[PDB]
């Protein structure tokens, strides 16, 4: 047992992929570990996507990880547009001028390569269909075929569709070891709660309050901290609340 | 009858193994007596294992008792890691640093012997199989072969598997006289209720509320008190609620 | 007929042995009459024995009656211990200290004589065997030989064993005129119902609710009142609900 | 035929002895006609006797009819005691005090004459024997010898004894023209059904529901209404359900 | 054959006397044809007579047919009383008042003539004797002498009496061509079945269900529909079940 | 023997006239062969005639065979009426309207020729006499004189009349080679069984069940399948039971 415990101790990964922008989030969760399902939830338009996107950006950009992004609601272009802006600390969607300026400027192309030039980000859309298996098959491919370290499922609202899916999702994450972040629309009580390993909730006015509704691994619950949305850069920043 | 009553009076063990950390629990139960089945239940991640583990630690450590631990879900190493941390008032699982520091430090080994060096704790896993008799046979051995005073079954969720098992469990405890603590997952009404001699339930936010759902021997029901989980030491502490 | 009615009127015993601790129970039943079978039932650990024991105590102690107690499940010592505590308003079973203190104190012996010194209580156990006739023969002896006014059968759970027994019990009570109180475990619909003259049920939380499920003589059904269990004295007290 | 029909029309008794206490019973049955067998049935202790007794009381008291009462189970004194109480709106059987008070008071005797002083009620018991003919012979005498208008058979539970008796009963009622009310214990499907002209069933809680299971003459079936038992007067009263 | 078939086709009476009050009965039987024996059966007091009487009333009243009614059990007056009420949509038998009011009112006589004034209905009773031939001779006379189009035999319960009678009945109907409706008491399997051309059964609660147990001519079996008995008019009405 | 076997093999007619409407009947009988006596039996009004008539219709209509029909009970017109309706999928006997409409319509005549215009069907009645030889002589003529391929004997109920007839029938069929279908009334055990080559039984409610009680040639016994009677067309249809 001794030797058995020892190696077990020295082989265990407690700290996963560290989150960004919120001082305290890592304290109460110790980051995202492989095989776990992270659930990021809150009210519509409360900043879920932004937050996740930011995590994705840092993970694949600074952590040198491969990030797959599966969009159920919006298109790839939309997603790409969002990441590009984010990476360049500008809101493309809000500036008809910038979009126009950047294309003839040649900055679009320079931006596109400096972000997707590499084999780091994998964006997939057109899952508009309500079939789970069709979805799991793509996810599995993103894992195996594209070697994605993190998979972000955007999004789900919240029957068996969700119940069974959550159970399929959790099974996929646990057996492969990928990090599966799922974005869910809330319109704790608010499978969703059960299978999810860590549940993060953002709150606003009723500056965004980051609440850790659940963390199996750590058990440490409560509010991790606050973030301040930069309307000019579109980045959620750490706060001094 | 007189002499018959007398010796009966002076031979009866009313107070069993006293519980720890919760001021009031012993008041309403008078501890754990041999031949009784203690059922500790609550919601998943509500602190069941910790609480039991704590009892186990004190029993085998301060009460000079032999404690057998049979794990159905997790591994021995995991359990050992938990007890070691607990005994050393540190959360090994939450600190990649501490785990690493303690091994080269030589504190791991010192810790391992200072806890399992003796013949006091008996951890058994690999009961992954859904066979009762296979399980009872091991328990019986832990009692007879290893002379365990207390046996902790971790865990059960939650048909006849449970019904028959609970009935087998209760039969094993009553005939041998060992103290059998069983951890059950609840997802009073929540054999489970019938065979169990004392049922303890922990409640949280939705500080942990310790509710005595049932105690045959004493009949004294209700909430025994409150405990405060120390996120730094992992110990459940008595509260001033 | 006139003279015939007259003496009949002046010779009829309407009010039997009055019950104690529950204000209203006597209103709806007019006490326990000879030749009747009183059935006290409820959920396990709901206070059946206590209640009956209390009645027994008062009957044999204050009403100057001879009470026979036949225990199928527990031992005489256990029963004696319970009555002694009850009579002395203390819970011997819950205090390892008191038991010890009382024996060297000399209070045990003083207590024993002040209760069983007389020829008032007759405790019989060892009916562990499932034979009715063996049982009826003892009951009949308790009636005839020991002249018991009240016989308490503790207990019955829960075929013909019960059916035939209930029919034998009712026959024994009717022909001798003794008061037969039977304690039955319920795990109205819940011979048991048919032969029983009065059926009392205790209800709890899932303060005890005393419900009169049936009373042939009076026909007056419903809830007689409430009782409050004194965890320190072990006595069920009348309530102000 | 014309004259034949006419006199037939003006000679036919459609409305028999009207029942009391239940608003609606007369609507669905048009009372009790001579030569008919009324069957009053229900569960033991459900109020059969009371109801019949009440009818008997009114019939012989207000309707100026002669009522014979044949008791198979209980004694005359018991029956007399019940009628006396009923007539005086008091429950003699439930008050050891009243019984005692009334005898020395001189009210017993005054009550006895004011009820049985006249030649209106004829109570007969001691039919304990299971012989039909012995029974029919007495009934026939009560009809012919004592000129009873109504005969109440109390009671019958649940072969040929009943089959043959019911057939003998129905034959006796039809040929003499007396009103035969029979009380039967039920432990429609529940000769009993066939020979009986009207079948009344009382139902309780699992306030008494009066159900007309069958009425040859009228064919009008269903629930006639509800009654409320007065625990202080022992009278079944009409309800506002 | 051609001409032979033709006239055969144009000379065949498929639709007999149409029934009334039950929407669907004519669908599955196409009415009552001459030379056929209609058997109306069901439980005692289930509405057999009423139903037949209603058919009789309409046949002789609206269809301008001559209806003979032979009563084995009851008297003519009884039958007349029933038809008169029926024709006047009132229940004479249930109203001691109406009977009395109608006679002095002069409405009885007006009613009697407006129904039996004509030579349409022929009521015969006093067949109390169990002799078939005595019965057949009267029936034959009702056919030949009184020219009855429909003969209703009321009633028969379920030997040769019935067997031979049914065979005599069927022979009489087939050779004369009259419509013979027979009412039989049932206490398909329930000559009776064999000789009868159409068998109708009424069912009640476990509103009356009209079941066509057998129809030679049509072969169309099953439940024809439902009827609703009007307790105030005594008429069976068509239902919306 | 070889050549002897060969030609024997290539000259043997195993499959006779195939039956219609019942999927499976041909499986278990392989149709009707010449020289065989087919016995169709069941309860009165169970659909015997219809079934046979249907076979007859198809045989003479689609199989281009000559079908003789000898009716013992009913008339030719009746039979013709039945075939005409059948061929035109309408129930002439059930519609006084259709019969009337079809005659003035000119459809009767068109129908008559389109069915009997040819020399395919030969209907013979008036065998009311109980003489066998008179009957055999006609049958023989239908075979020889009219060259009938199939002869349907309708009907016989299940002495020597039947015994001797069955033996004469079987002798006639075997020596001529015609297909003789006989309809028998049943009021296996139910010459009839012995001489008959194939026995078919129809059963109803517990839709008609077609049971193959016996088939010499094939030996294959049991229930061949089910049929559904079309009350609007009068045709027995194959079922999906």
- CA B101 to chain A, closest CA, distance in angstroms equals 10
DSSP string, B33-54: PTT-EEEEEESTTSSHHHHHHH
Mutate to test the interface with C, among B7, B15, B219, B224 (most CBs of C within 10 A): B219
Q: Which residues pair with A37 in a beta bridge?
A: A180
Q: Indicate the burial class of D96 (C-beta count within 10 angstroms; 0-12, 13-18, 19 or more).
A: middle
Contacts of F156 (CB under 8 A, 6+ apart): F72, F162, F165, F182, F183, F184, F185
Instruction: Judge: A14–B99 Cβ closer than 8 Å, yes or no.
Output: yes
Report resolution in angstroms. Answer: 2.3
Pairwise CA distance, residues E169 & E195, whole Å: 9
Return the H-helix or E-strand segment holding B193.
Answer: helix B192-195
Instruction: Judge: C94–B13 Cβ closer than 8 Å, yes or no.
Output: no
Instruction: Judge: B77–A220 Cβ closer than 8 Å, yes or no.
Output: no
∠ Cα D162 D163 D167 (to 5°): 110
Contacts of F224 (CB under 8 A, 6+ apart): F22, F24, F25, F27, F28, F29, F210, F211, F212
Sequence ranges of the binding site of C for ATP: 42-49
Pairwise CA distance, residues F241 & F237, whole Å: 12
Return the H-helix or E-strand segment holding A83.
Answer: helix A76-87
What burial letters (b/e) apply to B98-136, b meaning 16+ CB within 10 Å? bbeebeeeebbeebbeebbeeebbbbbbebeeeebeebe
Distances (CA, A) of C76 to B8, C61, C146, C179: 10, 19, 17, 21
Pairwise CA distance, residues C82 & C92, whole Å: 7
Neighbours of A117 (CB within 10 A): 10
Distances (CA, A) of D165 to A84, A176, D160, E40: 102, 84, 7, 32
Whole-angstrom distance between the N-terminal and C-terminal Cα of chain E? 48
DSSP designation for E146:
T
Tell me which chain C residues have a C-beta less than 8 angstroms from the C-beta of B15: 96
Instruction: Judge: F123–E10 Cβ closer than 8 Å, yes or no.
Output: no
Pairwise CA distance, residues D233 & E58, whole Å: 56
Please report the sign of the dihedral spanned by the C-alpha atoms of residue B196, residue B200, residue B204, residue B206: positive
- Cα dihedral value E3, E7, E8, E13, nearest 10: 170
Q: How many CA atoms lie within 13 A of C127 on its CB side?
A: 23
Per DSSP, the three-state class of B126 is coil
Pairwise CA distance, residues E202 & E25, whole Å: 12
Pairwise CA distance, residues F230 & E220, whole Å: 10
User: In what side-by-side order are the strands of the sheet with C121-124?
Assistant: C121-124, C67-71, C150-156, C179-185, C37-42, C198-204, C208-215, C222-229, C236-238
Cβ atoms of B35 and B20 within 8 Å: the answer is no
Cβ atoms of F31 and F19 within 8 Å: the answer is yes
- Pick the closest to residue F221 from F29, F52, F39 (CA basis): F29
CB pairs under 8 A between A and B: 51
Instruction: Judge: B12–C108 Cβ closer than 8 Å, yes or no.
Output: no
Whole-angstrom distance between the N-terminal and C-terminal Cα of chain B? 48
Residue E220 sits at the chain F interface (C-beta within 8 Å): yes
Copy the structure tokens of residue C19: 């019950």
How many residues comprise chain E?
241
Cβ atoms of B236 and B47 within 8 Å: the answer is yes
Mutate to test the interface with C, among B3, B14, B211, B223 (most CBs of C within 10 A): B14
Tell whether A222 is in a known binding site.
no
Q: Indicate the burial class of E80 (C-beta count within 10 angstroms; 0-12, 13-18, 19 or more).
A: buried
- Pick the closest to residue E2 from D43, F117, F185, D169 (CA basis): F117
Tell me which chain B residues have a C-beta less than 8 angstroms from the C-beta of A30: 94
Pairwise CA distance, residues F160 & F154, whole Å: 19
Q: Are strands A198-204 and A179-185 parallel, antiparallel or unpaired?
A: unpaired
Q: With DSSP H G I counted as helix, E B as strand and the rest as coil, what are the percentages for chain D, rounded to 5?
A: 40, 25, 35
Facing B94 at nearest CB: one of A1, A9, A14: A14
Tell me which chain A residues have a C-beta less than 8 angstroms from the C-beta of B45: 214, 216, 219
Tell me which chain F residues have a C-beta less than 8 angstroms from the C-beta of E220: 231
Pairwise CA distance, residues B95 & A220, whole Å: 14
DSSP string, D9-67: HHH-----BPP-S-TTHHHHH-SBPTT-EEEEEESTTSSHHHHHHHHHHHHHHTS---E
Phi first, then psi: what are they for D32, rounded to 5°?
Answer: -105, 120
- CA E223 to chain D, closest CA, distance in angstroms equals 24
Cβ atoms of F211 and F183 within 8 Å: the answer is no
Cβ atoms of B120 and B59 within 8 Å: the answer is no
Facing E81 at nearest CB: one of D5, D15, D214: D5
- Pick the closest to residue D236 from D211, D215, D209 (CA basis): D209
Whole-angstrom distance between the N-terminal and C-terminal Cα of chain C? 48
Technique that determined the structure: X-ray
- CA E206 to chain D, closest CA, distance in angstroms equals 9
- CA C220 to chain D, closest CA, distance in angstroms equals 7
Copy the structure tokens of residue F44: 């009165």
Tell whether D44 is in a known binding site.
yes
Distances (CA, A) of E190 to B44, E41, E102, E206: 64, 9, 42, 16
Please report the sign of the dihedral spanned by the C-alpha atoms of residue E215, residue E220, residue E221, residue E225: negative
Q: Where are the domains of chain D?
A: 1-241
Residue E78 sits at the chain D interface (C-beta within 8 Å): yes
How many residues comprise chain A?
241
Instruction: Judge: F103–E10 Cβ closer than 8 Å, yes or no.
Output: yes
Contacts of F110 (CB under 8 A, 6+ apart): none
- CA B86 to chain A, closest CA, distance in angstroms equals 15
Contacts of D170 (CB under 8 A, 6+ apart): D37, D191, D195, D196
Mutate to test the interface with C, among D74, D82, D85, D93 (most CBs of C within 10 A): D93
Distances (CA, A) of E33 to D106, E178, F111: 80, 8, 28
Pairwise CA distance, residues F57 & F20, whole Å: 10
Tell me which chain D residues have a C-beta less than 8 angstroms from the C-beta of E123: 1
Place of tokens 């959920």: C43
Pairwise CA distance, residues C206 & B13, whole Å: 31
Q: Which residues pair with C37 in a beta bridge?
A: C180
∠ Cα E140 E141 E145 (to 5°): 130
Pairwise CA distance, residues B42 & B190, whole Å: 9
Per DSSP, the three-state class of B17 is strand
Return the H-helix or E-strand segment holding B69.
Answer: strand B67-71
- Pick the closest to residue C123 from C83, C87, C157 (CA basis): C83
Q: How many CA atoms lie within 13 A of F241 on its CB side?
A: 16
CATH class held by domain F1-241 = alpha beta
Pairwise CA distance, residues F142 & E19, whole Å: 45
Pairwise CA distance, residues C11 & C17, whole Å: 17
Alpha carbon B44 to its chain's center:
16
Element counts in chain E: helices (H) and strands (E): 9, 9
Distances (CA, A) of E15 to E12, E22, E26, F77: 9, 16, 9, 19
Facing D103 at nearest CB: one of C10, C214, C217: C10
Pairwise CA distance, residues D19 & D26, whole Å: 6
Pairwise CA distance, residues A137 & A155, whole Å: 17
Return the H-helix or E-strand segment holding A41.
Answer: strand A37-42
Q: Are strands F222-229 and F150-156 parallel, antiparallel or unpaired?
A: unpaired
Pairwise CA distance, residues A141 & A145, whole Å: 5
Residue D103 sits at the chain C interface (C-beta within 8 Å): yes
Per DSSP, the three-state class of F101 is helix
Cβ atoms of D25 and D227 within 8 Å: the answer is no
Element counts in chain D: helices (H) and strands (E): 9, 9
Partners of chain C (3+ Cβ pairs below 8 A): B, D
Cβ atoms of C212 and C28 within 8 Å: the answer is yes
Alpha carbon A38 to its chain's center:
8
Cβ atoms of C203 and C42 within 8 Å: the answer is yes
């Amino acid at each position: 047992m001794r030797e058995r415990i020892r190696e077990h101790l020295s082989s265990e990964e407690s700290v996963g992929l560290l989150f960004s922008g919120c001082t305290g989030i890592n304290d109460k969760t110790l980051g995202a570990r492989g095989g776990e399902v992270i659930m990021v939830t809150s009210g519509s338009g409360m900043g879920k996507s932004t937050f996740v996107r930011q995590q994705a950006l840092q993970w694949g950009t600074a952590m040198g990880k491969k990030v797959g992004l599966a969009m159920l609601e919006e298109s790839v272009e939309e997603t790409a547009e969002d990441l590009i802006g984010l990476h360049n600390r500008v809101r493309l969607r809000q500036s008809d001028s910038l979009k126009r300026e950047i294309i003839e400027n040649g900055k679009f192309d320079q931006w596109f390569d400096e972000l997707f030039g590499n084999d780091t980000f994998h964006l997939y859309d057109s899952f508009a269909e309500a079939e789970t298996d069709r979805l799991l098959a793509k996810l599995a491919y993103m894992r195996s075929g594209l070697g994605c370290d993190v998979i972000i499922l955007d999004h789900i609202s919240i029957r068996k569709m969700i119940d069974n899916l959550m159970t399929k999702l959790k099974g996929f994450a646990k057996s492969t070891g990928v990090v599966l972040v799922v974005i869910c629309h809330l319109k704790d009580l608010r499978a969703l709660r059960q299978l999810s390993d860590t549940i993060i909730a953002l709150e606003r006015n009723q500056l965004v309050l980051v609440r850790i509704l659940k963390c199996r691994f750590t058990g440490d619950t409560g509010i991790a901290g606050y973030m301040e949305y930069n309307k000019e850069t579109g980045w959620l920043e750490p706060s001094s609340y």
